């Protein structure tokens, strides 16, 4: 997360509204995915904050 370098926001709203058929009830869910377009570039490799350790593992 850099400010200068920030990319925007993504939001989603009802355009009209969800309508369930009779005999049906409750919440429905959306699943959401993310992937990169063929457009994409990544550069300057470094270490991930996503993994660390405190002592060497053993068998």
């Amino acid at each position: 997360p850099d400010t200068y370098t920030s990319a925007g926001f993504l939001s989603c709203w009802y355009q009209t509204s969800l309508i369930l058929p009779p005999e049906t009830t409750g919440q429905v869910y959306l699943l959401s995915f993310i992937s990169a377009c063929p457009d994409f570039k990544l550069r300057l490799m470094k270490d991930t904050q996503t993994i660390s350790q405190t002592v060497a593992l053993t068998e």
Partner: protein
């Protein structure tokens, strides 16, 4: 596997997809185009903001209920406040535009109801007072709110009687104007492309509206048993081929 039924309209930085369309109407079989020189009069070069004005603005939603009489929006008024379209509008002396109108209303296979979506070129409204009472400015410039035909007569406002189209003609004959129906059982959207229609090559965008879009329930909404008795209707509209000319100080309009 193309159906008349599924469609995508991409205009500017905005896209609409419908999976339950009923073709689309192009008024008088003509598609919006810019103003040719042979038809030009004002000597000013015009400004064509392109993608910053020719995108889709979704007006605030309406609620169709069993008592609804119908709603009416005027163009370019309805868009007088949308993004840069609106700014351009108040800032140039003259402007010209065509539009893509997409009216949306989805339900389920147990609902019934049918809306008429029609575009009327030069819809001069009538005063409910009769005689030669005029319809004040503000009343014919409702903005994005549009006019609600089931609202009460107001003073200086137009008549809101539906069997008479707000002008002394019968609802039944509105079908002579470019229009499309939304029949819950068939359809879920209506799309009409409006070419610029006027008796002058370019005009003022504030003193004269050149089309009213009208959505009118005709077969009443009927929801399945113990369903909520109402559906929202949404109108999204995109200026297309817009041109502005005679830039200056920025109009100040009543109210």
């Amino acid at each position: 596997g193309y159906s008349d039924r599924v469609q995508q309209i991409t205009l500017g930085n905005s896209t609409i997809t419908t999976q339950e369309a009923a073709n689309a109407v192009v008024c008088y079989a003509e598609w919006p185009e810019y103003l040719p020189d042979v038809d030009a009069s004002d000597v000013n070069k015009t400004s064509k903001p392109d993608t910053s004005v020719c995108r889709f603005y979704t007006l605030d939603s309406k609620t169709w209920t069993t008592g609804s009489k119908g709603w009416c929006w005027k163009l370019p008024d309805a868009l007088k406040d949308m993004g840069v379209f609106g700014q351009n509008m108040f800032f140039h002396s003259l402007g010209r535009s065509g539009y893509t109108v997409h009216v949306q209303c989805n339900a389920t296979k147990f609902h019934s109801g049918c809306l008429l979506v029609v575009v009327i070129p030069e819809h001069q409204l009538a005063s409910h007072e009769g005689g030669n009472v005029s319809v004040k400015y503000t009343f014919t410039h409702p903005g994005e709110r549009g006019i609600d035909l089931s609202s009460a007569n107001e003073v200086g406002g137009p008549v809101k009687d539906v069997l008479y189209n707000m002008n002394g003609t019968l609802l039944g004959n509105l079908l002579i104007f470019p229009h499309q129906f939304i029949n819950l059982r068939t359809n879920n959207t209506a799309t009409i492309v409006i070419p610029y229609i006027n008796s002058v090559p370019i005009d003022s965008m504030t003193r004269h509206n050149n089309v009213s879009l009208m959505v009118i329930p005709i077969a009443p909404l009927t929801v399945p048993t113990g369903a909520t008795p109402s559906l929202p209707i949404t109108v999204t509209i995109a200026p297309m081929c817009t041109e502005f000319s005679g830039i200056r100080s920025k109009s100040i309009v009543p109210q």
